[PDB]
Write a protein that binds this DNA or RNA. Structure first.
Ligand SMILES: [Mn+2]
Length: 476
RNA sequence: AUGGGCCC
RNA sequence: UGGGCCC
């Protein structure tokens, strides 16, 4: 995005310099090159002379202004993708009711009861429970006012900033590159679900390479489905973006909402409007109130869906801008926000696409750092998606999501107080695909202290989930 | 100490 | 109601 104005308001909001992620017994054993993100401005382990909040908003390099030819090209790509998208999902995207928006629908889960309320509720100190009732499906008078304001399109708001308490690489922790969370108001999140919840739910259930979205997927079971698809193609690319969410230019965002969420496809008139308010935002960090143009605020409703849609359109846009006579069936892809895997039988040159992505404001680079110039001939077994490799299981002969051991060590090395036991059960479901020897080694430090599930138990669970009949066939 | 997904 | 992982 582009920072247009900065000013210090008289009021001030509390941040989060507590870092709840404490080390575990594993940390001393594995000695990982990872640690909690630097939340304090005077954090001792930061590099010399690094002002934290200075680095925080360094992602906002600018709002890439597109030309009329480029905007016209982008509009056609948005329309063509939208055509494909709604032909699979259908045209049933009617306005969702207040009950359905809160309680969810078949595909879309309910809203989080105990979570950050946003502005101007966090200042006065009113949580979601005060405004919206739990397990009820109704809204208070403060929210009701916002709904009617959003109908007339008079509603305005400001995004609340929060430092993301998470584990990051020590190089980025020392650099002071802590990621930020853009918390929108609860009424915005609610109304967004009313406008496009029917659409979002439908995408989750129909996730796959056809619509080009992995939002709604379960890696354990769906890795087989995706693996077999991408293995069929000759060339596969593990593309990585640089600040994908921040670098969404206004022209790209505005045109995408105008083509995808039209009244022709069943959406409400305000479905376009509510999404367009994400373009120009006002972010509140402590005392500084920063007005920003362009970029997606990470924390609005359907952020992963909007990013996924934009990601799909960018690939279509970039190819058509370089090559001639390119269509949707020319290539295949699936994405989850910024994360993407592209494939095609044609020998496409992604190195030549670099500047065509730069017109959108995006900077694509290869995930595989070796050479670092977008080579050809790669397969699904080389690439990564959702921090998971695609490896063939030696027993069942299906693809399984295998995370890197160094990543798994970093996860196990840190935890909140009291959550260690429950975390060890959850992470074991991820670690099972690494293999019996690697599974044992990852949970070796925790032996004789916490409950560690067996390899046999979690493997047999996965075999039932990935198919179910595969387990039954082995008996006969 | 968000948005959504998935597993508990 | 709470925990984890991914984006
Ligand atoms: Mn990737």
């Amino acid at each position: 995005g582009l920072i247009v104005d900065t000013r210090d308001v008289e009021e001030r909001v509390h941040v989060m310099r507590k870092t709840e992620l404490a080390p575990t017994v594993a940390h001393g054993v594995f000695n990982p090159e990872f640690g909690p993100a630097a939340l304090s401005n005077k954090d001792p382990r930061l590099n010399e002379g690094v002002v934290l909040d200075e680095v925080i908003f360094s992602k906002h390099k600018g709002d890439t202004k597109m030309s009329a030819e480029d905007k016209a090209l982008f509009r056609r790509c948005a329309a063509d993708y939208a055509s494909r998208l709604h032909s699979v999902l259908g045209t049933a995207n009617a306005p969702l009711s207040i009950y359905e928006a809160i309680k969810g629908v078949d595909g879309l889960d309910a809203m989080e009861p105990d979570t950050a309320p946003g502005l101007p509720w966090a200042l006065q100190g009113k949580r979601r429970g005060a405004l919206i009732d739990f397990e009820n499906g109704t809204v208070g008078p403060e929210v009701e006012a916002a709904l009617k304001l959003m109908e007339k399109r008079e509603y305005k708001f400001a995004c609340q900033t929060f430092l993301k308490d998470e584990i990051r690489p020590m190089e980025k922790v020392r650099a002071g590159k802590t990621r930020i969370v853009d918390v929108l108001p609860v009424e915005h999140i609610l109304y967004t679900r009313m406008m496009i919840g029917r659409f979002c739910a439908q995408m989750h259930s129909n996730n796959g390479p056809q619509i080009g979205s992995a939002v709604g997927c379960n890696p354990d079971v769906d890795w087989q489905r995706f693996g077999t698809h991408f293995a069929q193609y000759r060339n596969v690319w593990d593309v990585d973006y640089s600040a994908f969410d921040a670098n969404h230019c206004s022209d790209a965002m505005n045109i995408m909402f105008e083509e995808v969420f039209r009244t022709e496809f069943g959406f409400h008139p305000n479905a376009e409007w509510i999404l367009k308010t994400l373009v120009n935002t006002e972010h509140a960090y402590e005392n500084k109130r920063i007005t920003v143009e362009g970029g997606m605020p990470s924390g609005c409703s359907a952020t992963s869906i909007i990013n996924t849609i934009l990601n799909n359109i960018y690939v279509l846009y970039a190819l058509r801008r370089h090559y001639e006579g390119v269509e949707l069936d020319t290539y295949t892809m699936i994405s989850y926000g910024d994360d993407i895997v592209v494939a095609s039988d044609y020998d496409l040159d992604f190195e030549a696409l670099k500047p065509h992505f730069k017109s959108l404001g995006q900077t694509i680079t290869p995930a595989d750092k070796s050479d670092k110039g977008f080579v050809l001939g790669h397969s699904i077994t080389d690439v990564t998606f959702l921090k998971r490799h695609f490896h063939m299981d030696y027993g069942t002969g299906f693809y399984k999501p295998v995370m890197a051991s160094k990543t798994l060590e970093a996860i196990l090395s840190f935890a909140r107080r009291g959550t260690i036991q429950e975390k060890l059960i959850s992470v074991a479901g991820l670690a099972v695909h690494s293999g019996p020897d690697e599974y044992r080694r990852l949970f070796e430090p925790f032996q004789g202290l916490f409950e560690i599930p067996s390899y046999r138990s979690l493997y047999l669970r996965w075999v039932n989930a990935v198919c179910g009949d595969a387990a039954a066939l082995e008996h006969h």
